[PDB]
Structure 1
Amino acid sequence: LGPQVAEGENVFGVCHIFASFNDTFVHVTDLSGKETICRVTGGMKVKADRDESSPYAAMLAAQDVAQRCKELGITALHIKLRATGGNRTKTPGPGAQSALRALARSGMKIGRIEDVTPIPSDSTRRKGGRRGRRL
């Protein structure tokens, strides 16, 4: 199982952190991104809908992902943190910071950090009306 390399040198995966304001995704994949190692979402670690975007759920997801990756021989991660993008918000959700902190806390090495939020040159109409979300 895992790679056949010396233990001193790191094996790099890529961690996509899709932190929205509803819940957070921690998704480790191959360097190419085509093959995935583990994906733990904040909604898989809490029972309340309101808590799926909480920092605690993201921390639990990051610990699960880190343990699974260590079980598979990946020791270092490139981070690709994104917000919802498109019409919607361009800022990362509440869980992104806790997810990154818990990834680094469990002994996982961190490589390049990138913001891959989808940004439109310009987009379709945004979901709200011309008066917006009024409540």
Structure 2
Amino acid sequence: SQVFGVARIYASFNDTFVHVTDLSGKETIARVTGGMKVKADRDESSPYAAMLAAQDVAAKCKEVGITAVHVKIRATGGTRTKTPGPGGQAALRALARSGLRIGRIEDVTPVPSDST
């Protein structure tokens, strides 16, 4: 018997977010960023920064009790890159390694229908 969170891995520019939520979407669990692990302000979008960020999220979520994670990668959307950078795959590799069962990898990046 396993229970499921939802990753919502944000592969932004100049930053990376990982925060697993229970699969409604309200009760977020352990928001981390790329900034709050590294100390340089130059590579707060580092793949290594996202790696240990996802490691700390995996530790806190195993502490709470969720074992599998439906993972959803979101790029910055809008009229911008529309496609995950390197930090998304870095966090994905990290929390796929770190003892956490992974389900239903997707892409929830917004598409504009030709906005401004």
Q: Normalising to structure 1: TM-score of the pair?
A: 0.83
Q: SS where residue 7 of structure 2 aligns? A: strand
- Equivalent AA in structure 1 for residue 54 of structure 2: A
Residue 23 of structure 2 corresponds to which residue in structure 1? Answer: 31
Please identify the structure whose Cα radius of gyration is greater: 1
2: distance between equivalents of 1:122 and 1:27?
A: 30
Gap runs ≥5 in structure 1 = 1-8, 125-135
Deviation at 1:21, TM superposition (A): 2.4
Matched to 1:25, the amino acid is F
Once superposed, what is the RMSD of the aligned Cα atoms?
Answer: 0.8
2: CA distance between counterparts of 1:107 and 1:113? 17
Identity of matched residues, %: 84
Q: Is the contact between residue 53 and residue 93 of structure 1 (CA under 8 Å) also seen in structure 2?
A: no
**Matched residue SS, 1:57:** helix
Specify every segment of 5 or more residues in structure 2 that has no aligned partner in the other structure, as ranges: none
1:13 aligned onto 2:5: yes
After the TM superposition, list the runs of 4 or more consecutive aligned residues in structure 1 that deviate by more than 6 angstroms: none
Match for residue 120 of structure 1?
Answer: 112
- The answer to which structure, 1 or 2, has the higher relative contact order (CA under 8 A, 6+ apart) is 2
TM-score, normalised relative to structure 2: 0.96
- State how far apart, in whole Å, the 2-side matches of 1:86 and 1:118 are: 6
